[PDB]
């Protein structure tokens, strides 16, 4: 119920801050969570400014207006997460939480290790033939894999699915898997997944030819 | 120190009920507040409402009421939280979280606006007419084709599960470093895949063995896959 951007990008050592907007919200107090990937929320900021013990200085928080703004200074890997303001509503008796903002942490750009795995024989004992192509410790996120059986583009019959940020290196791993009958997968020779990144100069294939 | 421990994960029919419980330790219980927070998969937060352990009194948000019921058990410091006739979209990790309320209890008809300070570890509600699955585990082989400088890539295709979650590990949670478990997608099928994949030096490839530990509860299904070269 209170508007947030998206997204907020910025380099290590740089100052982040993230809006949180509301009318009249600067009369109301203003908290604020932090959400790593696959965690709970911690509070990091309460009452408009102030912080939890262990929570560290970098962490700063304003209320005016018709905004509220968290501030992280020295920004770091591990300031990576979605971050979350939240007010009491006295007129209606509710909590209400912002839509979040996702804190992505810019580095130098990082090509992905590319690998390729063959379906086992005992999925295939069981007729159907998963392989899969994985993307290994890559920075930006953005990316593109393409599957090629035979020298032909497949469509429709493969998944993927991403990471979030490292903690650390503050880079991203992709898993894309290609699923076929075990009768289509025996009717090919050569499979292989193409895959495109800006850390490549020219797009990277890896395959196996079965 | 002070923790919220949950129960674990649930899988429930459409027009079902769930209670999630919320065992409280570190404090004194009924000093704070207890709310429920959910967040469905990739979603923000969304507060259900509080209940005052103290005087056992509730506060429901609208979207709710009607539909939750909000308890607790002084004498194990446990809240509760039981949200009925479920639907597809009630689907989410519920959330309970402690709120300070300085006016316990020498006071009645106010509200302390408190911070959520403290937060639950969380539990996953899954609701859906599909049927509980276990998982079938296939290997990843590491080979020319999963190497580099000196690093071999190999790991376990946990597939075709319902519902979420699946806990992977790895040598009985011997090795941590260099593994990924990526997010589960949701098949065609209805059923859920994921990959947890480890980068390890080749040189041990030989002299080394791997298992993925695959554990998923909800169907109490517990596999131990060798991953071979
Ligand atoms: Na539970």
């Known amino acids: 119920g209170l508007t947030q951007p998206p997204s907020v990008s910025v380099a290590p050592g740089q100052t982040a801050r993230i809006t949180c907007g509301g009318n009249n919200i600067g009369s109301k107090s203003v908290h604020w969570y932090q959400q790593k990937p696959g965690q709970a929320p911690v509070l990091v900021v309460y009452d408009d400014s102030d912080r939890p013990s262990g929570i560290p200085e970098r962490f700063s928080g304003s209320n005016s207006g018709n905004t509220a703004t968290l501030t992280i200074s020295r920004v770091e890997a591990g300031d990576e997460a979605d971050y979350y303001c939240?007010?009491?509503?006295?007129?209606?008796?509710?909590?209400?939480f912002g839509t979040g903002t996702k804190v992505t942490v810019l580095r130098t750009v990082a090509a992905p290790s590319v690998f390729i795995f063959p379906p086992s024989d005992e999925q295939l004992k069981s007729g159907t033939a998963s392989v899969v192509c994985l993307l290994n410790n890559f920075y930006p996120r953005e990316a593109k894999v393409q599957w090629k059986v035979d020298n032909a583009l497949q469509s429709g019959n493969s998944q993927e699915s991403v990471t979030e940020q490292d903690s650390k290196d503050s880079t991203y791993s992709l898993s894309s898997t290609l699923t076929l009958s075990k009768a289509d997968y025996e009717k090919h020779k050569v499979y292989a997944c193409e895959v495109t990144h800006q850390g490549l100069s020219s797009p990277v294939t890896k395959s196996f030819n079965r | 120190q002070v923790q919220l421990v949950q129960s674990g994960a649930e899988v429930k029919k459409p027009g079902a009920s769930v209670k999630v419980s919320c065992k409280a330790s570190?404090?004194?219980?009924?000093?704070?507040?207890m709310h429920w927070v959910r967040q469905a998969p990739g979603q923000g937060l969304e507060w259900m409402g509080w209940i005052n352990p103290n005087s056992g009194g509730t506060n429901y948000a609208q979207k709710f009421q009607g539909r939750v019921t909000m308890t607790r058990d002084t004498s194990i410091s446990t809240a509760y939280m039981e949200l009925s006739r479920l639907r597809s979209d009630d689907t989410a990790v519920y959330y309970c979280?402690?709120?300070?309320?300085?006016?316990?209890?020498?006071?009645?008809?106010?509200?302390?606006?408190?911070?959520?300070?403290?937060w639950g570890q969380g539990t996953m509600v899954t609701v859906s007419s599909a049927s509980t699955k276990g998982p079938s585990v296939f290997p990843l082989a590491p080979s020319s084709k999963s190497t580099s400088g000196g690093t071999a890539a190999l790991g376990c295709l946990v597939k075709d599960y319902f519902p979420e979650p699946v806990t992977v590990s790895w040598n009985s949670g011997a090795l941590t470093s260099g593994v990924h478990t990526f997010p589960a997608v949701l098949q065609s099928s209805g059923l859920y895949s994921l990959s947890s994949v480890v980068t390890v030096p080749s040189s041990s490839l030989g002299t080394q063995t791997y298992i993925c530990n695959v554990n998923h509860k909800p169907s109490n299904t517990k596999v131990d896959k060798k991953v071979e070269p």
């Open positions: 939240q007010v009491w509503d006295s007129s209606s008796d509710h909590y209400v």
């Open positions: 570190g404090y004194t219980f009924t000093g704070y507040y």
């Open positions: 979280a402690r709120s300070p309320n300085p006016y316990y209890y020498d006071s009645s008809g106010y509200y302390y606006p408190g911070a959520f300070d403290i």
